[PDB]
Nucleic acid binder design. Structure first.
Lengths: 92, 88, 91, 91, 91, 92
DNA sequence: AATTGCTCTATGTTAATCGCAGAGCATATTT
DNA sequence: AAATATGCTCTATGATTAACATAGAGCAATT
């Protein structure tokens, strides 16, 4: 699948997506996009996948739809983040 | 469905390996990262076309290594990778 | 909200999907996409949702991912199907 | 377009709407939203289209605008209702 | 290994692509593949080589991407091609 | 398969061999190698493929192994060459 | 000359990036 | 009170390409 493009040399689009939720805790699909530079279509495409994977859950208030990392989604993040520190430390 | 490349791309694992070793063969580049060989070369052909890597054929032995340009990309991207973790 | 749908006016693409899951039980994405004429891409984005609700389960078979309707999905299926005869009947 | 969402799993909002007019003859855009469980803005949206496609026509009842199906409407209902059965044929 | 080429038995798919850019000036991934009848994958993968050598360059026209031979690329397409005629006149 | 390479940019080794056989008429394995500069292990490999399709047949003229074209390899020689021309022609 | 072996090529199946056209609903408008 | 222009948000899905596996094939070295 299209994973390594000129825009995602090292990190994938979902990476920045999750890293964002880790901070804001909860955010709108639009808020995720404009804050990560990742185009909206790519965001929800990965959000749909995150939902099916149980990493992220959807919240709704009639009109306002928010997304947040589930406990396992937070487990995934704090796991992949440790592979980064490795990459970069083994490295230098 | 990629469970293998969640946060990191296979391209990264390749760039990094060519940093700690400097000179590596498409076969070893694959093994030491557990990335399917067919992906290695396919990414190599792209890295070559972008001057991020230069080939060095010492006979029948093939060797791919980072260039001055590719090295800059390596030390550049990696920094971006850290700053993203710092705040988190 | 300018509407133009010559394809989905009464039935959603998600419906045809659910249905095909009852016949074959388990099938790949590139598979049900052909037996329903529903474009492959649309299928994935819909099977994901069915996974997010637990209406379907991902069962890999070697290298090819297989999607099979679950109990809760079977419920949704048979339950929402009767909801359709409760309409056709009176009309 | 936005066909299948959380509320709509099998049938689109149009299916219901028409199914409503196919039982109440002519009802106000409000009274449809009342029975269809569909929000007001959505119904108006589908109506603005139904009328533009010669599927539905207004009927001026004085100080109100009850909406009634047209001959083109039944030409669509029964013509759509059959894709359901051809579909729910294997249950 | 073993040999079974049904197509490229005398010419490389690289030969075609090179020839194309020499008469078209500017071509995209699809264009080459569509005309040369060489499969898309082979093309996109061969340009990489023509780029790693500096024989071809990239013309970014908005979204779509074009490819054109370079100085060294031209001095290659006009040289090797001569060893073609030097080869056919040997008869 | 391994078709395009650093040397076989335009023509393949099977091209050099065949087109050279027409002129030279006939020759031994190593002879082909020396002339077209193509390594033996390569020349010998493709010859095996030629002796398999009938394009070329080996004829024991002494103790060496003489490799000379055939009819199957003639219908092909002119066939490929014809396309080779269709290519350099439109280049104009 | 034939088999073994390593490496890179040709290329199809699948999938994931990002775009355009929808379309579901909520507000602010509006005769 | 009911209707529309309007602003979001997510869906339908086509086009480009990457992930990567199969079948080659250029080229030593061994049998």
């Amino acid at each position: 699948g299209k994973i390594s493009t000129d825009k995602y040399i090292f990190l994938t689009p979902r990476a920045y997506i999750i890293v964002h939720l880790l901070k804001v805790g909860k955010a709108k699909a639009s808020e995720i996009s404009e804050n990560t530079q990742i185009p909206y279509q790519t965001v929800i495409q990965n959000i749909r996948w995150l939902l099916a994977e149980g990493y992220v859950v959807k919240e709704q208030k009639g009109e306002e739809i928010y997304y947040k990392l589930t406990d396992k989604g937070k487990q995934l993040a704090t796991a992949e983040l440790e592979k980064i520190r490795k990459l970069v430390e083994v490295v230098q």
